[PDB]
Design a protein around this ligand. Sequence first.
Ligand code: CLA
Ligand code: CLA
Ligand code: CLA
Ligand code: CLA
Ligand code: CLA
Ligand SMILES: CC1=C(/C=C/C(C)=C/C=C/C(C)=C/C=C/C=C(C)/C=C/C=C(C)/C=C/C2=C(C)CCCC2(C)C)C(C)(C)CCC1
Ligand SMILES: CC1=C(/C=C/C(C)=C/C=C/C(C)=C/C=C/C=C(C)/C=C/C=C(C)/C=C/C2=C(C)CCCC2(C)C)C(C)(C)CCC1
Ligand SMILES: CCCCCCCCCCCCO[C@@H]1O[C@H](CO)[C@@H](O[C@H]2O[C@H](CO)[C@@H](O)[C@H](O)[C@H]2O)[C@H](O)[C@H]1O
Ligand SMILES: CCCCCCCCCCCCO[C@@H]1O[C@H](CO)[C@@H](O[C@H]2O[C@H](CO)[C@@H](O)[C@H](O)[C@H]2O)[C@H](O)[C@H]1O
Ligand code: OEX
Ligand SMILES: [Ca+2]
Ligand SMILES: [Cl-]
Ligand SMILES: [Cl-]
Ligand SMILES: [Fe+2]
Lengths: 243, 450, 31, 31, 56, 334, 32, 37, 39, 36, 30
Amino acid sequence: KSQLTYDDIVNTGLANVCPEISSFTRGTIEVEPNTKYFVSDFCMEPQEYFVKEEPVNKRQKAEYVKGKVLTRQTTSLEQIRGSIAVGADGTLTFKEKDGIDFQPITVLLPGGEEVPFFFTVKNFTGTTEPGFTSINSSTDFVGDFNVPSYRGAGFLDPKARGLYTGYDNAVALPSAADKFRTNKKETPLGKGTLSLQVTQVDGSTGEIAGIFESEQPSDTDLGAKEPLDVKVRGIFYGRVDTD
Amino acid sequence: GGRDLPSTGFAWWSGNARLINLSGKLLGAHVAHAGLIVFWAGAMTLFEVAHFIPEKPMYEQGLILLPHIATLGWGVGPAGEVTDIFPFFVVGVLHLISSAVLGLGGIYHALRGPEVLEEYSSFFGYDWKDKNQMTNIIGYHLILLGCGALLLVFKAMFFGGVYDTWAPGGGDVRVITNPTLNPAIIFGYLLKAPFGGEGWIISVNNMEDIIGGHIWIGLICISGGIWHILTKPFGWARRALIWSGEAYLSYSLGALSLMGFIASVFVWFNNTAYPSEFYGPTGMEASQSQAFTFLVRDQRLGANIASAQGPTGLGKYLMRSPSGEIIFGGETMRFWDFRGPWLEPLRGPNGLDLDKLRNDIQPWQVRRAAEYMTHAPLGSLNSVGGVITDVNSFNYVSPRAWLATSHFVLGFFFLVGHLWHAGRARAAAAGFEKGIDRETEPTLFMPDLD
Amino acid sequence: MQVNNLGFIASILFVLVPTVFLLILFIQTGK
Amino acid sequence: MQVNNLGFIASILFVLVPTVFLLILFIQTGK
Amino acid sequence: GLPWYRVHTVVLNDPGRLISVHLMHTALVAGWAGSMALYELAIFDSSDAVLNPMWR
Amino acid sequence: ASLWEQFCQWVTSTNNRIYVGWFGTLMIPTLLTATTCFIIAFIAAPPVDIDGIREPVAGSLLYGNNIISGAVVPSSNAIGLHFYPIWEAASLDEWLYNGGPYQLVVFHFLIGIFCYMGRQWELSYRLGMRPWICVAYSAPVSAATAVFLIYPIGQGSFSDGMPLGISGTFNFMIVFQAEHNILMHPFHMLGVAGVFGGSLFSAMHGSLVTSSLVRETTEVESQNYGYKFGQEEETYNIVAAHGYFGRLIFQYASFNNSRSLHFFLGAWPVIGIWFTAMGVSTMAFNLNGFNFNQSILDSQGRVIGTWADVLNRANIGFEVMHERNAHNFPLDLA
Amino acid sequence: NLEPIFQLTFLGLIVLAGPAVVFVLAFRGGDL
Amino acid sequence: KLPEAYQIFDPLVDVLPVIPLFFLALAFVWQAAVGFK
Amino acid sequence: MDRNSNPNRQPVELNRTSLYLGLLLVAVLGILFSSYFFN
Amino acid sequence: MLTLKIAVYIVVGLFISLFIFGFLSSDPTRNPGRKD
Amino acid sequence: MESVAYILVLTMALAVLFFAIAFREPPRIE
Ligand code: CLA
Ligand code: CLA
Ligand code: CLA
Ligand code: CLA
Ligand code: CLA
Ligand SMILES: CC1=C(/C=C/C(C)=C/C=C/C(C)=C/C=C/C=C(C)/C=C/C=C(C)/C=C/C2=C(C)CCCC2(C)C)C(C)(C)CCC1
Ligand SMILES: CC1=C(/C=C/C(C)=C/C=C/C(C)=C/C=C/C=C(C)/C=C/C=C(C)/C=C/C2=C(C)CCCC2(C)C)C(C)(C)CCC1
Ligand SMILES: CCCCCCCCCCCCO[C@@H]1O[C@H](CO)[C@@H](O[C@H]2O[C@H](CO)[C@@H](O)[C@H](O)[C@H]2O)[C@H](O)[C@H]1O
Ligand SMILES: CCCCCCCCCCCCO[C@@H]1O[C@H](CO)[C@@H](O[C@H]2O[C@H](CO)[C@@H](O)[C@H](O)[C@H]2O)[C@H](O)[C@H]1O
Ligand code: OEX
Ligand SMILES: [Ca+2]
Ligand SMILES: [Cl-]
Ligand SMILES: [Cl-]
Ligand SMILES: [Fe+2]
């Protein structure tokens, strides 16, 4: 988005782009052995989406397939606040706190299946190897994050069935109402893995940018079906408060 | 001229058609009708003043003329508080008295004045086929219209200014010192798409643009007036157009239908020339206000409104526009192009700004959002406010609703009138407006279709 | 979709039979 | 009996269509 | 008149209408090709080219 | 003489089987575009996220709809009133998912029907007719414009345009009643008078003309063969029809002037439809039907119900269920 | 009170005015 | 409301704006007096 | 261009015996093949 | 997409220009009655 | 496969329209 105004930004798609630092940037951010530093405006911009297709044969490699986004430039996490703590040994621990840390995204795959998934970084705690006295181009924050159910427990399906609202049976079929498995709605808390490869550090201003790859399940439609495996590759940016 | 069917060929219910070639009588009809317009302006203004409670908002009291005067900067102060009630009274009184004068003149010309003016004076006498004279009347009236636009400019610049809802420190009457004469902005307004997010000319959002466009309009109108006084229609115009009184009427009807539609849209969407201080919120404004009100309330309750996902998986309070901008969630996603003075302070370059939302919201913004949400332009025909399923205790219909509905209806019926008169003018010029001639019925000389 | 198993026959005959009635009457007309 | 689900439509059309062809030709004959 | 099995012999000496009926036949054949392909596409299962190829 | 003049004489030619004309030069391309896109979408369009909540609605036959339930689904609420042509989509699949076909079909259709009205005027001019058939046609055009353009404009989204389908039409009407009480709107009552009365007058006029047909056939053949196309004489006895009708009600309520009668036949439904089109167009700005909810109080102050209250109960029942996942906040303002 | 009384007085006078003009012209032989 | 000096003609200003409707009606009165010639 | 009546058009006929023969042929073909259509 | 946008723009411009120049080509003259 | 039936009936109606326009009985003045 550079340094424009909303008048310059509106209807351009720049609002969905994470800022970039610079080119002549090979700095490092010095850190104290056991103090923690705030992360100010953390952004993640996905660029590639893969869904692990499930073969019917058995026992054979599943081969992630490239999808295309049907939802528009609504796919980026931003204004996220966090913290980086330096362990006793030198570990760097990145902890997501809050912000716009989720986006629902629907991708189309070859064959016509549309895969909605809850792209998120919620409650992501990630760590590096010990012996890091600096944040630099080798910093890898590999960690886990939570994936809430795509549809909340207030959602109603096309037959007005839901979890804490709606029917618990197929009311349109009075003599077969309690026969359908989808009469029970479920919101399991799925789990994701994320890695945050820092590739560019401008220690003067504290901005860090890099690449990410995330692994997480897709929408189950309140437990209607088994989640697929979605892989997201993108880029990220954030400011680290040194003081 | 005759005054009955045998001597005119027109029944009583089309009696005004008898006036087409009686220029003096036609002038009387026009002047008397103008008297009617000015009379309504004055009488409605006095009614609204009499029925005005000046500490209650204008839009809560069914007022459509007083907001026009307030927008011009008369009788109001910051946030639209009515300072002096006398200027509204003066506008009404002056229109009423002048309507008396106009009605006297219209009656004189319609009842006793010369029937036709052409043997009385060449200057005022006209013939519909006299192209030079018709363009002369166009020129005079264009000069007048440009002068009126310049009157608006002079009021905004040299006579106390106009109400600026976008003023820093609060909406206030302010003097416009730097109108934008830059033709790029002024005429790029005319090129903006008439769709969501662009808003062809309805999107003009600052009084500098309005005043500068009115300077340009005044100059264009005056120069076109001179151009039409000093020339006659060219060959292409002569070959393309029907040159008759009814044809000119139909042309004006089409123009009026266009303007009526434009005004209805303008009052529905634009909150600059129609400040919400006097006209109440737009529907977009009220929807956005409700979203803001519950963002504020739930945030005070402790909800982390940046990360709260709604039932569908979209953010309950905040989400992205299809172009990525941070916008209010819910159904009001459709209204993310809304801009208002109470909401722009919380907007960053990317849209709604989390830091401002979390620590920059002022109590006056909360009050304004609550007021706008509860004065959404929804109401029954018998003036029961709110959604149609609400009960009878809230007597409110937005002035925007009244103006927009009325002027869409008038625009439509004037499109109908334009179709009627354009078709009739063509048929009469070609000479079959009275029906098919049995002797020379055109279809009888045509080859059969198959 | 689990539709009525007589739907295809019903719809096709519903159209076909009056169609051939009209066709017969039209084609023989002028005999 | 689990018979072919297209049997009824196939048999009925197999008979019906040539039947109406013959009927049309016969009825119009002499026009 | 003509027996049923001889009706098409009316374009025997009418080159324009012979071209017409040839065109109509060509249109029918091409339309069959298009609609056959559309139906097959509507029901084709492309997920497993190994054990469920087109010829199965 | 010149090439352009020859083209002009061809386009404005009254000898073409289908009159083209200058309005036709716009009508034909736009109407064909709209028809082709509509047919393609109705058969095979993928589901559309009409409410902008990632809740796609299947409208096409190939995705499980029948003719009654099928529709071309209005574009997404996220689009709002934005222009969404094909070239503003990242891909055709995105355009389809967000309901672009609806915008394409609707915009072309609207241009086409306005050009159809202009073309009616044009042909009337070329044939030496009076020019006002297009004025009558302006009533259905006004209604279609109200439901496809004006209502979405006032409501702020093309997702609130009428869907291009049978069941979609019914959904539109039910939600409209829930939100605007159109039944209790006098302009819709005038529309109902327009169509009920138009059918009434169609039945009377046809029945009175058929009743007064002059005997020209035998009891075997259709009486229709008693009329020959282009015959100068009158085919029915209007005086006998007037005698019958003026005795059915009373003399002075019966038209004996065929011209006044036919003007009345034209004017009644057209005016009614104009009024109902304006009713929809003004309910687009949420100036709704009459609200008599709790208008009758007893002396103590308890509400006495009327049929309007029962109607309001039905409206609330529709209101709370419609677009069940789309609302986050208590008031349905959008 | 008296507001409806005065209102109806002005309204009735205004209402009679137009018909009074037409009646006077018709009876006195004016042009109509 | 109206400035204080004018509120004795308050019940007159209440009926002023509706007059042009009376003008439209008066057209029909005049045409009825002339027999709708 | 002009639309001229085509002089090559001829009436078709199917006499009553031909009708009975064809109807019987159709009926017996249906009798024969229906069992295989049902399978 | 850009190719499509350009093609549609040309097609629409051509049809609109056809309509405009057609109605400018002495259209009132094209009638079976008076041509003045 | 009921899609086939729907498409079939719709196509029948459209074909009827084209024939009713193109191959209509000509109105003739006699
Ligand atoms: C400035 C605009 C304008 C002007 C100057 C004219 C002028 C004229 N029109 Mg015209 N017209 C217009 C707009 C205009 N029209 C519009 C917008 C429409 C669409 C409805 C029409 C449709 C129209 C038709 C169909 C005809 C004319 C005709 C005429 C000619 C004679 C009409 C007459 O005697 O009035 C007579 C006045 C009446 C009979 C009273 C009518 C009352 C109306 C119908 C209801 C008023 C409702 C109003 C909102 C108030 C509500 C009252 C409520 C409280 C109950 C005349 C030259 C006639 C003509 O063609 O002449 C050659 C004719 O046949 N016009
Ligand atoms: C704005 C509305 C309007 C106006 C300005 C006119 C104007 C006119 N009409 Mg007309 N008309 C109208 C609406 C209007 N009409 C409507 C709605 C209908 C359908 C009923 C008609 C049907 C009609 C017919 C059939 C005819 C006209 C004719 C005329 C012309 C001659 C007037 C005349 O001699 O009558 C005389 C009437 C009187 C003398 C009665 C008194 C009239 C005065 C003006 C009343 C004013 C009262 C006012 C409150 C007093 C204040 C005075 C001052 C102190 C301010 C005239 C210019 C005639 C014409 O065309 O001439 C060739 C004609 O034959 N009209
Ligand atoms: C557009 C409105 C209009 C038009 C075109 C006319 C036109 C005409 N009038 Mg009329 N008149 C009008 C309104 C109008 N009048 C009104 C409202 C009244 C009531 C006061 C009168 C009362 C009236 C009477 C009693 C007579 C005329 C006469 C005439 C004719 C001769 C004009 C002349 O040379 O005298 C001279 C013109 C001037 C000396 C120019 C003076 C210009 C005005 C008065 C000064 C103000 C200019 C102003 C700043 C410009 C903008 C106006 C502002 C409100 C925006 C002429 C055809 C006479 C006639 O018919 O001859 C037999 C006649 O005896 N008029
Ligand atoms: C109410 C004011 C008014 C009126 C009634 C007229 C009337 C006329 N003018 Mg004009 N003019 C005016 C104001 C006015 N003018 C002003 C203020 C200026 C100064 C800029 C001019 C400068 C001017 C010139 C240079 C000429 C005229 C000419 C004419 C005559 C024929 C032009 C024509 O057919 O129009 C219709 C326009 C066309 C047929 C061209 C098509 C324009 C496009 C293709 C239409 C698309 C519009 C679009 C749908 C609307 C979108 C709005 C916006 C986004 C563009 C005609 C009598 C001509 C003439 O004969 O002079 C004597 C001429 O040469 N005028
Ligand atoms: C290119 C191939 C071709 C062409 C152009 C013709 C053309 C002709 N044949 Mg011929 N024929 C052919 C191949 C062809 N035939 C073959 C392969 C055979 C062996 C089966 C025959 C045996 C044959 C006989 C015995 C006779 C003809 C006759 C005729 C003439 C009249 C046709 C008619 O009205 O019948 C009209 C047919 C009907 C009204 C109903 C036919 C219904 C059939 C049985 C079922 C249709 C199935 C399906 C729709 C066809 C598509 C299948 C396709 C893949 C082949 C005509 C010029 C007649 C003749 O000589 O006239 C003097 C004649 O008596 N043909
Ligand atoms: C032509 C014609 C016509 C028309 C007419 C017209 C259109 C008119 C008009 C007219 C007018 C347009 C008028 C007027 C008037 C006014 C007046 C007469 C006034 C006044 C005043 C006063 C008296 C006021 C007072 C007051 C004041 C001062 C302030 C306070 C308040 C009060 C109000 C008290 C018609 C249709 C009928 C028909 C016949 C023909
Ligand atoms: C003030 C203002 C402004 C400005 C504005 C402007 C400046 C404007 C304008 C405008 C204009 C300047 C316009 C226009 C127009 C035009 C038209 C409307 C046209 C047309 C046409 C026609 C009508 C034609 C027709 C025809 C044809 C089609 C062909 C044949 C012939 C004929 C003629 C028929 C702004 C917004 C900035 C701001 C705010 C305020
Ligand atoms: C309570 C009792 C019933 C109340 C009835 C109210 C309705 C009555 C009619 C309303 C007025 C209609 O007005 C009627 O118009 C007709 C048109 O044919 C005109 O009819 C008359 O015109 C003129 C009058 O000046 C005569 O010269 C003429 O011979 C006669 O036909 C009159 O102006 C009036 O008779
Ligand atoms: C006969 C009538 C006249 C016909 C002549 C008109 C020809 C068509 C002109 C259309 C011009 C193309 O319009 C051009 O669209 C491109 C698309 O890349 C826009 O380009 C902009 O938006 C696009 C998204 O769509 C971005 O990918 C691109 O990086 C950005 O620059 C330009 O801002 C605009 O100038
Ligand atoms: O989108 Mn279709 O309806 Ca028009 O009201 Mn709000 O928006 Mn939704 O909610 Mn109810
Ligand atoms: Ca009062
Ligand atoms: Cl719904
Ligand atoms: Cl909501
Ligand atoms: Fe008839």
